[PDB]
Amino acid sequence: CPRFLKVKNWETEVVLTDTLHLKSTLETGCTEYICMGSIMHPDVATKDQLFPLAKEFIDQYYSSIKRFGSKAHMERLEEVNKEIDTTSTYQLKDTELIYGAKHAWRNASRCVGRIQWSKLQVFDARDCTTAHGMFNYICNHVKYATNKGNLRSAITIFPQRTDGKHDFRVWNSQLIRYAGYKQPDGSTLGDPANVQFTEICIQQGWKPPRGRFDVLPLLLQANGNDPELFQIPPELVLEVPIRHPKFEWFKDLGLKWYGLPAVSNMLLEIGGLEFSACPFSGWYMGTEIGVRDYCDNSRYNILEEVAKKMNLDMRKTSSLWKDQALVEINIAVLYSFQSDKVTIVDHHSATESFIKHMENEYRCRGGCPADWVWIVPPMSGSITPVFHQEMLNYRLTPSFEYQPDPWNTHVWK
Amino acid sequence: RFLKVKNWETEVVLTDTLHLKSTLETGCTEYICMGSIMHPATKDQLFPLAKEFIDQYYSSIKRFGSKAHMERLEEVNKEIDTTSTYQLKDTELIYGAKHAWRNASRCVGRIQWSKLQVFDARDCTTAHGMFNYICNHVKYATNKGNLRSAITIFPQRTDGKHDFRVWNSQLIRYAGYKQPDGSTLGDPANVQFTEICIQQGWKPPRGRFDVLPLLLQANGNDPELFQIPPELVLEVPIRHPKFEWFKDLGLKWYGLPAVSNMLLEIGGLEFSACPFSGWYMGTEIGVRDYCDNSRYNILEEVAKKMNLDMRKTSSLWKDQALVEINIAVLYSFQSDKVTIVDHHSATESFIKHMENEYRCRGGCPADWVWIVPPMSGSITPVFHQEMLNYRLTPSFEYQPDPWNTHVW
Numbered sequence A: 001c002p003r004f005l006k007v008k009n010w011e012t013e014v015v016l017t018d019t020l021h022l023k024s025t026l027e028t029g030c031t032e033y034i035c036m037g038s039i040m041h042p043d044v045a046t047k048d049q050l051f052p053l054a055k056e057f058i059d060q061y062y063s064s065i066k067r068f069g070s071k072a073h074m075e076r077l078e079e080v081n082k083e084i085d086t087t088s089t090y091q092l093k094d095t096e097l098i099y100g101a102k103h104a105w106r107n108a109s110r111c112v113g114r115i116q117w118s119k120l121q122v123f124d125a126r127d128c129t130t131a132h133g134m135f136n137y138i139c140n141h142v143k144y145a146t147n148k149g150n151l152r153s154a155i156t157i158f159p160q161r162t163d164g165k166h167d168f169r170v171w172n173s174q175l176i177r178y179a180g181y182k183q184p185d186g187s188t189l190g191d192p193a194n195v196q197f198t199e200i201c202i203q204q205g206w207k208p209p210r211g212r213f214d215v216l217p218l219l220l221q222a223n224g225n226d227p228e229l230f231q232i233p234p235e236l237v238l239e240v241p242i243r244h245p246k247f248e249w250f251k252d253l254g255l256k257w258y259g260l261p262a263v264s265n266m267l268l269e270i271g272g273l274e275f276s277a278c279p280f281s282g283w284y285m286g287t288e289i290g291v292r293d294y295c296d297n298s299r300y301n302i303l304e305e306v307a308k309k310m311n312l313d314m315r316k317t318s319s320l321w322k323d324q325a326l327v328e329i330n331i332a333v334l335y336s337f338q339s340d341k342v343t344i345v346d347h348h349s350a351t352e353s354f355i356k357h358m359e360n361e362y363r364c365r366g367g368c369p370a371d372w373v374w375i376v377p378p379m380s381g382s383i384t385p386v387f388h389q390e391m392l393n394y395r396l397t398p399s400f401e402y403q404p405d406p407w408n409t410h411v412w413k
Numbered sequence B: 001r002f003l004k005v006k007n008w009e010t011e012v013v014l015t016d017t018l019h020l021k022s023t024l025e026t027g028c029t030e031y032i033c034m035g036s037i038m039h040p041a042t043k044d045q046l047f048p049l050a051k052e053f054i055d056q057y058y059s060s061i062k063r064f065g066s067k068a069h070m071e072r073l074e075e076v077n078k079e080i081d082t083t084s085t086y087q088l089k090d091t092e093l094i095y096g097a098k099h100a101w102r103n104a105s106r107c108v109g110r111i112q113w114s115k116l117q118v119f120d121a122r123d124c125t126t127a128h129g130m131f132n133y134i135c136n137h138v139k140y141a142t143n144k145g146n147l148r149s150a151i152t153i154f155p156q157r158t159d160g161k162h163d164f165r166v167w168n169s170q171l172i173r174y175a176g177y178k179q180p181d182g183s184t185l186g187d188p189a190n191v192q193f194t195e196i197c198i199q200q201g202w203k204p205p206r207g208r209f210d211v212l213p214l215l216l217q218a219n220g221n222d223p224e225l226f227q228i229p230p231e232l233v234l235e236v237p238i239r240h241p242k243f244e245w246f247k248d249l250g251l252k253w254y255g256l257p258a259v260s261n262m263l264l265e266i267g268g269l270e271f272s273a274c275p276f277s278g279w280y281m282g283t284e285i286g287v288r289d290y291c292d293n294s295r296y297n298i299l300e301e302v303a304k305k306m307n308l309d310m311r312k313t314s315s316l317w318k319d320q321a322l323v324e325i326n327i328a329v330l331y332s333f334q335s336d337k338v339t340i341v342d343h344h345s346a347t348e349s350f351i352k353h354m355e356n357e358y359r360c361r362g363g364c365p366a367d368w369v370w371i372v373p374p375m376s377g378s379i380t381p382v383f384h385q386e387m388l389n390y391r392l393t394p395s396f397e398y399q400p401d402p403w404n405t406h407v408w
């Protein structure tokens, strides 16, 4: 591989030079003959596999604190090596846990929000043993992160994988989501994306109120045991009713959304260790709600009903009636969040911040992996600065990875 | 491997086998993806490429292994020997042109790929000849608004010292002028090319929508200027169905999109002048041409007339104005009976095209970064379509600007 790689911005002419790609680890999925850059998703480790992964991470940690080669560096290397020899694993210091989590965010190529990567609150939950403990930890996370609408980014890290039969997992894909319900007639109440998970929850004991915006219970798995259900206290679930600054009829659609986006189905890999329950949360970019959640045809799919209330001609696609309503729906979501003093960022501000971040990373770090397909917002793409920015995608570690759905792998006791 | 692509809205899964036949590079490796990078002979390299192309041509007319096939491979081998190159048969020229379009990963319009009028211009020797051939192209493809796809193929490269090149990047574009106060009149993307036209004799009217002259290079000689007869240049005043003040913005665009800076490669041969044209997708004009900050950049003005609050971005004033600008373009071409397609129709057509290519051909190389329209992405069906990108030949490739390589 060539040592220097250039990226250009076609709107400003700015050329950046990437050397960080030389530290790439796992596979993109691409080859020199095929590019999989639009593919969404393109047993444990052995002593011999773990040794070099830990050393790589420990080296990198001591490089960052400007102690590379020090006595504390070599002593940590030897302690780690001795520990892998006697137990086939090792335990991270708190300092290394925090560094690793912040860098998995920093390295998350699909995240436009990374300007904030070093302001992450890390909750060490590695002493947790039961699903009730997991509930306690997550409740405290949600309350801290919500902060009465002054949202603060945070991660709670549960115990790492051991033999693969004792995994901690949050079975929810996100900590806060609305249920969806299949009716006998084929229609769907609530969020259609969550019909499968809702059905699991119901069979597990949950009593569904069967509304359009029912907050799902937490389904928590500790130490490989069968998952258990918990209701998040509703006063911890901050929500925003959606209204429009001009269209007084917009509130009559009964739309609302929750304030905290909190991914809980991903795996955090640090130094070869696997943290299979590591829920992390930030704050929303408006398009995640106004464009995808509300206007995807497989989701709440409100474009038609907004278009009718807007009295648009909906017989020709070339009237752009869909595009017009999409803008108005996204004006309402940003307006409703700002009026309630709940942190949100529009797609224009977040992509300008990301460009500034990317440029600083190239300056100070030698690069910034970014997945263009995910960084570019789902509306108005080319009037945001990221559209015109060339990006290199590669995988650095520590990182967040996908993992199988726990109901597909769990062995029921 | 047989690779699978999933549509995340419909859950339709297709299976790609066609990628097994690529061999040109993508630019990516297992460790670094370059999917968002815009720009990632001799007798001995030439025959295997000629062979593969003849093989796929005779396989496409279902006469693989025919005597005609055999005699063609021998005919081509002898000619590469005596002459160091070879000439395509007319049937191979047309087949190669249509398949370079069929294989263009970045083109959302490929449902039309086999309906292409091919103009053989390989007998051309002078810039006057090129001008004639180009005028006939423009007149043919424009067709009084009922646009028809077309390509004009000038002589292939011989030694690189005698290239045919259209120096315009597109046959019809508007000039751009640097103003003394620092701002730009016209199209800022064409400032330098306009300066090269002026420095060579073109007298500019110095307006906002001056059709540029043609700058044509024949057989490696210096380029010569020509004005396309104005009755050949179809233009559309832009107006809005609801906002009667929109026509007062003074906006217009040309009807015919015609790329003239690319290289057509067929069986190892290189056609450095191959102007090709189709019809516009509305967003090409309304989003990029009009609202790119480095182009006509009219968002601020439209939002002014719309009285929108332009104090904070979160009012989405740019997004509102952008939609109204794109309504006007579609309404104007439609009112003037000039072929245009909106990004909803075009992307729907492309999904259907992919479905067709997967069944009958085993895949469709496609560049998600280019296929998804520059506005309202996720409400078009291609946003949710996984695509595999790989390089099939014949193909259109980029080439250096001639003002950076031509020896005067």
Ligand code: HEM
Binding pocket: A101, A104, A105, A108, A110, A111, A112, A113, A114, A116, A120, A153, A154, A155, A280, A281, A282, A283, A284, A285, A288, A345, A350, A374, A400
């Ligand atoms: C603080 C403000 C943040 C903003 C504005 C932000 C923005 C975004 C957006 C818009 C996406 C795309 C999500 C989608 O389309 O489904 C995303 C993805 C992602 N973000 Fe961030 N994010 C933030 C915080 C965080 C934090 C705190 C972390 C981790 C510690 C993180 C890690 C990720 C990851 C891993 C993804 C990829 C998810 C996937 O592949 O499905 N983000 N971010």
Ligand code: HEM
Binding pocket: B097, B100, B101, B104, B106, B107, B108, B109, B110, B112, B116, B149, B150, B151, B276, B277, B278, B279, B280, B281, B284, B341, B346, B370, B396
């Ligand atoms: C017939 C209607 C057509 C439509 C609606 C259409 C649509 C498009 C669009 C929207 C793009 C992206 C343009 C840009 O962003 O610069 C594109 C690119 C492209 N088109 Fe098509 N096109 C059509 C016809 C054709 C024809 C006739 C050919 C060749 C014979 C062709 C070959 C290509 C190629 C090679 C590109 C990539 C250009 C580049 O990399 O700059 N297209 N097309």
Ligand SMILES: Cc1cc(N)nc(CCc2cc(CCCN(C)C)cc(F)c2F)c1
Binding pocket: A113, A174, A177, A260, A261, A262, A263, A280, A281, A282, A283, A284, A285, A288
């Ligand atoms: C930390 C953080 C900050 C921020 N702004 N956004 C995110 C993503 C939040 C999120 C993502 C998805 C995607 C589901 C999978 N997708 C393929 C459909 C669904 C949600 F309900 C949700 F809340 C995370």
Ligand SMILES: Cc1cc(N)nc(CCc2cc(CCCN(C)C)cc(F)c2F)c1
Binding pocket: B170, B172, B173, B256, B257, B258, B259, B276, B277, B278, B279, B280, B281, B284
């Ligand atoms: C056959 C065909 C059909 C169709 N619909 N569109 C096209 C593109 C036409 C086109 C493209 C560009 C891009 C310039 C480079 N870009 C990176 C800024 C500039 C133009 F003036 C122009 F006319 C071709």
Ligand SMILES: C[C@H](O)[C@H](O)[C@H]1CNc2nc(N)[nH]c(=O)c2N1
Binding pocket: A038, A039, A040, A373, A374, A375, B008, B383, B384, B385, B386, B387
């Ligand atoms: C097929 C395609 O990769 C898929 O639709 C992706 C495209 N880009 C995306 N970008 C974001 N931020 N989120 C998504 O869910 C997607 N979906």
Ligand SMILES: C[C@H](O)[C@H](O)[C@H]1CNc2nc(N)[nH]c(=O)c2N1
Binding pocket: A010, A387, A388, A389, A390, A391, B036, B037, B038, B369, B370, B371
């Ligand atoms: C950086 C990025 O590759 C560049 O902006 C691309 C993105 N996608 C595009 N898609 C189309 N159709 N046309 C373009 O000019 C571009 N520009």
Ligand SMILES: [Zn+2]
Binding pocket: A028, A030, A034, A035, A036, A037, B028, B032, B033, B034, B035
């Ligand atoms: Zn790639």
